Amino acid sequence: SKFQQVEQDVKAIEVSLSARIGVSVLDTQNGEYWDYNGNQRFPLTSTFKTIACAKLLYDAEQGKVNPNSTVEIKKADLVTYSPVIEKQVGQAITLDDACFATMTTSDNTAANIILSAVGGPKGVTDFLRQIGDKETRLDRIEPDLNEGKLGDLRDTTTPKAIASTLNKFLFGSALSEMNQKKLESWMVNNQVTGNLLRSVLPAGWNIADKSGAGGFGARSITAVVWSEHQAPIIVSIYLAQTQASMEERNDAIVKIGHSIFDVYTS
């Protein structure tokens, strides 16, 4: 009953937005976990970016690639919504800076640059299987991976799978302490999620997050929140196949986030 209010809020949104919605909350401080449709499939959309950049750091540690190596930006590589890369045509960008761009602004060309350096969708999926994520899969690059059609298994995850994977990336030991901090900082420095969980974050708390939006109303956020008195809590919220406006989907995330935070501030 601890998450009773959260469950009620999710059920109300499910009805009002006639949507498929799933949530997973993992509390690393006491091993507690809760979910609603946590095993259901939803489109990753931009939430996959965190995994691709985690792989860049992991591959760098193994010596498979140099994160400081540069990649030439050609006008033909540009895809929809690439604020950082669109200003660097004809120039070279380091893989590390491409990850900074895609993690903090969600720049899509930057994400494709990272994917090309870490083995594409296939390399990313293989990496996920190695860390123990049996569900999440990446199959296409930007912009096609955002299609979000019902029943399509391509580019999907479950709320529980991605929350677990983020827990492992940031707090397990697959990545070095230095790289965990680097990945976490990229998420903390996200500039495009001010209207989601950040807008209801409790005073004194911290947050590292990455959100996404896509076809058929897909909307999501994967976040890690903590404070001086609360160890990391991983929150995964996904909506799919809804006609709801972006404002209504943001409203759903803010209401659910608020209730989740109340579980831990009350």
Swiss-Prot record:
Catalytic activity, EC: 3.5.2.6
Binding site for substrate: 210-212
Residue pairs linked by disulfide bridges in the UniProt entry: 53-99
The entry's keywords: Antibiotic resistance, Disulfide bond, Hydrolase, Signal, Transposable element
GO BP annotations, alphabetical order: beta-lactam antibiotic catabolic process; response to antibiotic
Active site: 46
InterPro entries on file: Beta-lactam/transpept-like (IPR012338), Beta-lactam_cat (IPR045155), Beta-lactam_class-A (IPR000871), Beta-lactam_class-A_AS (IPR023650)
Comment field (misc): The class A beta-lactamase family has a specific amino-acid numbering system, sometimes called Ambler or ABL numbering and often misspelt as Amber. A multiple sequence alignment was used to derive a consensus sequence and then the consensus was numbered taking into account insertions and deletions. This allows use of identical numbers, e.g. for active site residues, despite differences in protein length. UniProt always uses natural numbering of residues, hence there appear to be differences in numbering between this entry and some papers.
Known role: Hydrolyzes both carbenicillin and oxacillin.
Protein name as it appears in the record: Beta-lactamase PSE-4
